[PDB]
Structure formats: C-alpha cells, structure tokens
Design a protein around this ligand. Structure first.
Ligand code: 2UK
Ligand code: CL
Ligand code: MG
Length: 172
C-alpha cells in the first residue's frame, strides 16, 4: 500500500536511515547504493489504522541512478547531512526532480518531508543551522522537518511516523 521514496545526495545517510527504521540496525561502513529498491515495514498510524509501508532507497551518485519508480509514491522524503553545506542547498532540486518525473496530481499538496541527518556528529563539523532548515522547509510550502541520527537512533521513529501519517492521507 504505502510507497515512500527517499532522495538526497550521496553520503547524507538515506540507506542508513532506512535500515534504522526498518531493521533497528546501523553500520559504520559506507556501501554506495546502486539502482532503486525497497524494504517493507508493517505500521500502525497514530489513529491505530494499519498499513504496509514500502520504503524506497535510491542512489545519490548520478552514475548509480535509474525513472518509473518515482510514480506511485505516496510521500517523498528529502534528506541532507547537517555536516555538508551542498547537500542542504540541493534539497529543492531533489524536490523538483521528484515532481518533474513523478506524475502526481497535486504538486502543491503532495507530501514531502525533509530530514537533516547526522546530528550526533561533533559540533565543530556541523554547518547547517536548524534555522536555515526551518526557513527552507517553510519556503517550500511548510513541509515538515526533522533532525535525525540514523547512527544513535535519534528521532528516526518520530520522523517516520509523520512520513507514514502524511503518506496514508495521500494514498486514501
Ligand atoms: C562509526 C564510525 C563513525 O563514527 N563515523 C562518523 C559518524 C558520523 N555520524 C553519522 N550519523 C548518522 O546518522 C549517519 N547516517 C549515515 N552515516 C554515515 O554516512 C555514510 C553514508 O551512509 P549511507 O546511508 O550509505 O548514505 P546514502 O545512502 O545517502 N549514500 P548513497 O546515496 O547511497 O551514495 C556512511 O558512512 C554512514 O555510516 C551517518 N553518520
Ligand atoms: Cl524555481
Ligand atoms: Mg545509500
């Protein structure tokens, strides 16, 4: 039933976030994602309505990418790394890439969620203000925002409850 797509630059932590939420596990070892594929999780909404969530991981590197999979999606998650300025500045282009290729019926209502990942990292290395993120998140149509750590299992549960809630609303 529920199709969710996760987009964002290489290295931001998409695959890690998916393993955290679906499998409650994490691994330090970078293994580059190639082509799109999904894992599944049975969910229960805040309402105690039940659903199977199909979570799609995608490649961040141009050369490992795929097009069709974007269609169907009931929610789109946009992920940047709080330690990498460029990843953040690319969020709107990931959003627009999705809308161009996704063939969704109402772009101004279609649910996106943004995640800022790697908050567990040392302050010295962190670059993207919460404030900036909240600005970008509003300017893109008041999209929900969540700061997360796949590594330390921080807030990934919260983030994905909204992603679930927003996706079920869009499906039917
Ligand atoms: C354990 C060694 C250590 O201390 N490393 C530094 C800790 C940095 N913290 C941290 N926090 C996170 O929440 C987190 N998520 C993911 N990473 C790391 O970044 C690399 C990329 O992970 P992927 O999940 O492979 O990223 P991606 O899917 O977007 N890449 P693709 O688009 O597929 O190329 C990886 O090293 C992961 O461990 C985090 N690090
Ligand atoms: Cl524009
Ligand atoms: Mg990956």
């Amino acid at each position: 039933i529920l199709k969710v797509i996760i987009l964002g630059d290489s290295g931001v932590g998409k695959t890690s976030l998916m393993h955290r939420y679906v499998n409650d596990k994490y691994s330090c070892q970078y293994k580059a994602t190639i082509g799109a594929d999904f894992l599944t999780k049975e969910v229960t909404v805040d309402g105690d309505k039940v659903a199977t969530m199909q979570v799609w991981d995608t490649a961040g590197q141009e050369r490992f990418q795929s097009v069709a999979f974007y269609r169907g999606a009931d929610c789109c998650v946009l992920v940047y790394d709080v330690t990498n300025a460029s990843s953040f500045e690319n969020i709107k282009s990931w959003r627009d890439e999705f809308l161009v290729h996704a063939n969704v019926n109402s772009p101004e209502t279609f649910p996106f969620v943004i995640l800022g990942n790697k908050i567990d990292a040392e302050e010295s290395k962190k670059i993207v203000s919460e404030k900036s993120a909240q600005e970008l998140a509003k300017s893109l149509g008041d999209i929900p925002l969540f700061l997360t750590s796949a590594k330390n299992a921080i807030n990934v549960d919260t983030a994905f409850e909204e992603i679930a809630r927003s996706a079920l609303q869009q499906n039917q």
